[PDB]
Amino acid sequence: TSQIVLPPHLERIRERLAENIHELWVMNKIELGWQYGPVRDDNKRQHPCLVEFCKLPEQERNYNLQMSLETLKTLLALGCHVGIADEHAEEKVKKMKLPKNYQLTSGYKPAPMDLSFIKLTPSQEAMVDKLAENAHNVWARDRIR
Numbered sequence: 001t002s003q004i005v006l007p008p009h010l011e012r013i014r015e016r017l018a019e020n021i022h023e024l025w026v027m028n029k030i031e032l033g034w035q036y037g038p039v040r041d042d043n044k045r046q047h048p049c050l051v052e053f054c055k056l057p058e059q060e061r062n063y064n065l066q067m068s069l070e071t072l073k074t075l076l077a078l079g080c081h082v083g084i085a086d087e088h089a090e091e092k093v094k095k096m097k098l099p100k101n102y103q104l105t106s107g108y109k110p111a112p113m114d115l116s117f118i119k120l121t122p123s124q125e126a127m128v129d130k131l132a133e134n135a136h137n138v139w140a141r142d143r144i145r
Contacts, residue, residue: 001130001137003077006069013084014065016091020098022053022064024112027102035107050108070131080123 026049034047049056053064075082089097099111 001074001134002141003074006073006076010072010084013088014068017068017088018053018065020088020090021068023099023110025064025067026050026052027107027109027112030105030107030109033107070134074127074130074134078123 029047029050033045034042034050035045036048036050037044037046038048040048049060049063051060053061056064072082087093089095090099098113100113100115102109102111
């Protein structure tokens with residue numbers, strides 16, 4: 001799976017979406033007990049990806065935004081409507097939808113909402129295998145070469 005590159009019309013969304021999506025996603029790598037440290041290794045109980053979006057360096061700055069860009073480019077490549085009509089409900093339109101659920105421990109625990117009071121679309125339930133296969137697709141077009 002490799003469809004198109006994303007246009008820049010969303011770029012007003014993307015940076016605030018980044019300062020959201022890190023503050024949703026980065027909590028997920030402390031349930032082992034990893035913390036922030038200087039150098040890359042796991043034998044001594046750390047994972048330095050636990051740093052805020054702009055705080056990271058540039059190659060790690062985009063390494064948070066790539067999961068978003070996965071969930072954006074194939075969506076816009078899907079042909080369906082994914083134009084930003086319902087503008088995302090944090091930092092632009094004050095409805096307070098994005099951060100709802102969190103629990104703080106000995107570690108960086110920002111606020112992902114595990115949203116479950118709405119149905120999920122017929123698409124994104126079907127795109128679970130698409131987006132999880134795209135991992136091996138990205139890895140396979142590297143590996144077979």
